[PDB]
RNA sequence: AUCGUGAUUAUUGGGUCUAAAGGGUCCGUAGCCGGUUUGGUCAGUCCUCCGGGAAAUCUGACAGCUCAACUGUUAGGCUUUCGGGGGAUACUGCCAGACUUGGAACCGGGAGAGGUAAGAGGUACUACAGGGGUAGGAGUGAAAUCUUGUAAUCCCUGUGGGACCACCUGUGGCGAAGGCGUCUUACCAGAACGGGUUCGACGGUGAGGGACGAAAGCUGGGGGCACGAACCGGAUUAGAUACCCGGGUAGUCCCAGCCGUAAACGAUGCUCGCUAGGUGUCAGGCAUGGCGCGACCGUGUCUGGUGCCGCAGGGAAGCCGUGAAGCGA
């Protein structure tokens, strides 16, 4: 095609403790801790963030 | 006299004229489209080769 | 495919070279883990059939066939005998098509090259005289001064014998030439 | 910095013609770019062109039908009247009734033949042949 | 293109996709995101990473797509914006720190040139903003007196 | 003489790697060049109108000088590139926003002989002293000066000294260039890479002007192991004010300033779009196979550098060739 697309993609990560339905960005530049209870969903790697809990489904 | 990859005129020395390798209709090629491998598309049978 | 892909896998036709070019991408379907990139066998048979259709529009005694490699040397001679085409297997004189006072003078109407990179002098001579050429490239070949491309492994003895027999039988059936040669004739002496 | 998109588009068309490529992409599309492409299409020198937006200025997928020889911008865009086209034609163009100069005018952007028919001049935009 | 004072071009752009709509897979609302933006601003977090923390821990794809407003538009709407732009403040802050370092290392001519380049960028930002009325016409960038963190 | 020749002044219409010619690099004002886009104006601009732009000379014809040039009529030219009205809104400049790609700002895991400041360290050298030992050591094409019987050379021990950072080291890296190689630490800066992060054209170039600017040299204070212009001595030679060899001052080093030049070179100013390929390696990111299927290493692929090869293209050629000397701005 001619249009550019976001090769980096979102996720649907599920919290390991509070079961929060939070949303995180895959190429995280920050420690995406859980919004609600106690958890760190993924740590900021220079490339792709290392997710610690379940990914329900990778989104666009 | 008109290439199938560029359409330029075959007035120079070194122009190759040959029938189609699919339908037999005449297809032309120039030195630049043959040195550079320009893809030629047969306008009748739609044959496309590099 | 007119012949099964398992035969091309067994005969070494699908083996190529560890390095490929960008213009050979369209004839490659998948990267193998070894490094040798497998060409499109369906595309190879398509190119073979199209060339045989193009080679069937002319008499075998006007075709020109050239080869350089030893492994491509025997099937080239088999092609020359089975068709009557004037083959140049082995060493090639640079001024055969040109140089009318030279030994080996010829004035063809189509040129066939067994390997375009190795047979560069024949490509330059054909481009100078203006004779369209159906070539036989590999995974590390470029189609400069080439009209038709045959994607087959020219560095395999069995692959060369099989491909030469397929081209010979295809042309001889298309042009209703009596073809009593068999692949063991085109097979290299092992 | 990008500061002449019409000249960039015509230089890309020149490169694509020189290589003999049937198709080529046009870097960021503009309204005057579209007017030049439409007038060139009506001249028959250029085949097809589509504005494919990309969340940006927009680009073109132009199908070059092999009818031109060279085409770049006219810099500076000279003011031209109805009695001032023939000297520019003798300068840029190669022959009488051969190739056209893209002109921008208050009536519209068009080759200088139709501008002389309109009896209205303006600024030279480009030349194609 | 090349950079401002070094000619090393680069293409590490953040590829934002063509999205003319808000998310359809997210239940977040405009009120939620604006409340998050205001609370993070009151914490002391600059607008560059406000959107980053929106997009990372809340997975907000873009504040403009959902709210219809960018971060600074929401800041001006709520009277929660600074009097000076963040880029000019960052350049002036770096220049002040670099001048503080250079007042004890007078041999550090390379960082003197770095200070000169940042001064050129500061004057470029001030010229653009006075062109667009963000800053006063008479307030020139004094590199010794009128350069403090909050200028008044 | 002057015009043309001569594109030998080049806006049209030239060159500037090697022929004269890219500024050492860079920051940057006036100038100049500038993204797509909605809205408004119409100043340059555009079509048109009206006041002008003396005749003369210019062009053509007619008329009349016998042809002719020439005089009159007449249709054009010049006079130009002024003042003022109406129409158009593409174009540019003006007005008010917006838009995300251009540049700007921030975050992430990595890379780097990037910079200053401090310290420690490596080995060799050297100074003196001590122990051993006793006829030469040094150097050369060959010699001699020099040095040694006041015990040198060589060896061992010990204590100080100043310069210098090897192999590692790469057709590696960082830096605006100059340039930067021991290690540790503190301070600072840029980059590329990742980024549904902030900004909204904030950009390029840039005569003047400003800072950086190798080495040599200069000024003042240090230091002086080594090296080493000058200087002296020994040879060489016809001569040797040189190459060689023996000494060795200024200097090289540091601290505080000055000068401001190099074959400061890629003999290629900088920015952008565009244009066949094959081919190392480096940073980052990314797939996968192995890896003590972990810290790590391989192949593929996008981006940015760093080299060689080369089609088309161009050049007078050597050549250049997505890192142009190609094609435009
Ligand atoms: Mg010095
Ligand atoms: Mg230079
Ligand atoms: Zn939780």
Curated annotation (Swiss-Prot), chain A:
Its cofactor is Zn(2+). Binds 1 zinc ion per subunit. Part of the 30S ribosomal subunit. It comes from Methanosarcina acetivorans (strain ATCC 35395 / DSM 2834 / JCM 12185 / C2A). The keyword Repeat does not apply. One of its GO terms (biological process) is ribosomal small subunit assembly. Keywords: Metal-binding, Ribonucleoprotein, Ribosomal protein, Zinc, Zinc-finger. A zinc finger (C4-type) spans 15-37. Belongs to the eukaryotic ribosomal protein eS27 family. GO terms for cellular component: cytosolic small ribosomal subunit. This is Small ribosomal subunit protein eS27. It holds the Pfam family Ribosomal_S27e. The gene is rps27e. Zn(2+) binds at residues 15, 18, 34, 37. GO terms for molecular function: RNA binding; structural constituent of ribosome; zinc ion binding.
Swiss-Prot record, chain D:
The gene is rps8. GO terms for molecular function: rRNA binding; structural constituent of ribosome. Keywords: Ribonucleoprotein, Ribosomal protein, RNA-binding, rRNA-binding. It comes from Methanosarcina acetivorans (strain ATCC 35395 / DSM 2834 / JCM 12185 / C2A). One of its GO terms (biological process) is translation. NCBIfam families: PRK04034.1 (NF003115). GO terms for cellular component: cytosolic small ribosomal subunit. The keyword Ribonucleoprotein applies. One of the primary rRNA binding proteins, it binds directly to 16S rRNA central domain where it helps coordinate assembly of the platform of the 30S subunit. This is Small ribosomal subunit protein uS8. Part of the 30S ribosomal subunit.
From Swiss-Prot, chain E:
It holds the Pfam family Ribosomal_S13_N. InterPro entries: Ribosomal_uS15, Ribosomal_uS15_arc_euk, Ribosomal_uS15_N, uS15_NS1_RNA-bd_sf. Residues 1-11 have a biased composition (Basic residues). GO terms for biological process: translation. Gene3D superfamilies: 4.10.860.130, S15/NS1, RNA-binding. Keywords: Ribonucleoprotein, Ribosomal protein. PROSITE patterns: RIBOSOMAL_S15. GO terms for cellular component: cytosolic small ribosomal subunit. GO terms for molecular function: small ribosomal subunit rRNA binding; structural constituent of ribosome. Residues 1-23 are annotated as: Disordered. It comes from the Archaea. NCBIfam families: PRK08561.1. Part of the 30S ribosomal subunit. Belongs to the universal ribosomal protein uS15 family. This is Small ribosomal subunit protein uS15. It comes from Methanosarcina acetivorans (strain ATCC 35395 / DSM 2834 / JCM 12185 / C2A).
